[PDB]
Amino acid sequence: RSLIVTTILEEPYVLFKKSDKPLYGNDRFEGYCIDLLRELSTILGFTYEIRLVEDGKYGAQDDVNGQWNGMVRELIDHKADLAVAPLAITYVREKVIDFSKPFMTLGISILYRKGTPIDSADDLAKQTKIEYGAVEDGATMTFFKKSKISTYDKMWAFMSSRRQSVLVKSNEEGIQRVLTSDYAFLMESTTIEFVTQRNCNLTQIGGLIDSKGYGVGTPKGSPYRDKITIAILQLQEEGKLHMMKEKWW
Amino acid sequence: SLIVTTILEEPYVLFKKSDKPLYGNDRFEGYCIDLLRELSTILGFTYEIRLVEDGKYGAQDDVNGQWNGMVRELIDHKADLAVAPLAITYVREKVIDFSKPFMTLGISILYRKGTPIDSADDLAKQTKIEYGAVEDGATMTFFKKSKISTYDKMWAFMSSRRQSVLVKSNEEGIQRVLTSDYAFLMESTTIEFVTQRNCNLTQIGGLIDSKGYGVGTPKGSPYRDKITIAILQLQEEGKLHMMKEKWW
Ligand SMILES: C=C(C)[C@H]1CN[C@H](C(=O)O)[C@H]1CC(=O)O
Ligand SMILES: C=C(C)[C@H]1CN[C@H](C(=O)O)[C@H]1CC(=O)O
Ligand SMILES: [Cl-]
Questions:
Q1: For residue A232, is it left (φ>0), alpha (ψ between -120 and 50) or beta?
Q2: N or C: which end of chain B has fewer CB within 10 A?
Q3: Which residues does ligand 1 sit against, CB inside 6 Å?
């Protein structure tokens, strides 16, 4: 049978393919993660059906009820066989689902304007005039929520106190805020690179604040996890992942 | 108590400098030693460090398919963990398990400063400047296996000149760069260590590929996923970055 693959719209990883005529099935989608999935299927010999996660979320756990949502929740409940998306491999997620080895490596950094005196997270933390934030309940926000590093703890105190005003619901919302207010956006370096290639007034500020990878998610114990790892390593060694990144970035 | 196989390689694993001979685990320090200590704390195991007898990381014989090095120790259940700058590669992942990466890196080029050489392509299209890699390591194996024209050409060069351009260690490669017209294909994390210590040397071009180092375990080992979770904990609390800063 075909594997059910859960994913989510996020440029340039997953988007709706443009066509003058209606599109159906997997043909509706394109992007880096779609090429990846195609290449994985070519190596491993499975067929698949792409489905957008209904709740539009990656996967985080609620504090009170301990319930998961998003693509992670779909894998937990065995409603999908794989999740293929820019899904960060994190400690809390690894506790509840399995991940392939990374197909991309990245870190949190800062998206802001060029030509300013701001050069690091510490510069942001020490002031309040320039607002800053992150996608609510994502891996980036979770990093700040849990950090014991003085600088990042202060940034979390700032963001948490202004939740409604500085946390956003998507990368697109955060980017639009950098573009239309005095705002710096804490976001993943791979997506920053995409943005800065297309917006000459924007830049990454400072280096990477942490390090993580994106991996393909599976339900805990899935036999596909290790198979997908091996295929990913093959794709990397063949230069195919690099070609795919060049194509979409 | 777990048996941990490793290998000397600066600054991952070193013999501690000492007036008197040291014994057992006391003999060793380095990034990978700190990593092992941190893992042991999180997971609650004791361990004995043993240097791999054959001094190899792990490659497969092209005729008989047998493995050597730390990979062989794991396959043979002579060790529980391998903790070293052991690249997570397609061929190795097929026979042993690896944790998720504690360090990410890629192949690049170590050469002298001030030349017009700017990329692998520049090396491949000539022969006056010799180049090579550590024999049978993950770098050499990338070239051996690559279908990319430039890298296949470089493999043809290095292959045909095995005796003279392939080396036994990073140290031998670095000395070649310093004493002759030679460029050394080597891992970018080691290049970084080297170029911080020698201002006449530089990385040429960017990364040619991307890989990680991971802790190795025998296939099927229950420790693999526990070590992965520990590594993720160490990364998220900033410890892996501090460890790299400390040793580089
Ligand atoms: C696109 C966003 C919502 C996702 C993508 N990776 C992160 C994740 O896996 O949670 C989130 C971004 C972030 O937290 O900066
Ligand atoms: C120090 C060397 C021999 C090891 C380290 N990592 C690679 C490996 O895991 O094979 C080798 C280096 C290289 O191949 O450039
Ligand atoms: Cl894994």
A1: alpha
A2: N
A3: A 10, 58, 86-88, 134-135, 138-140, 171, 187-188
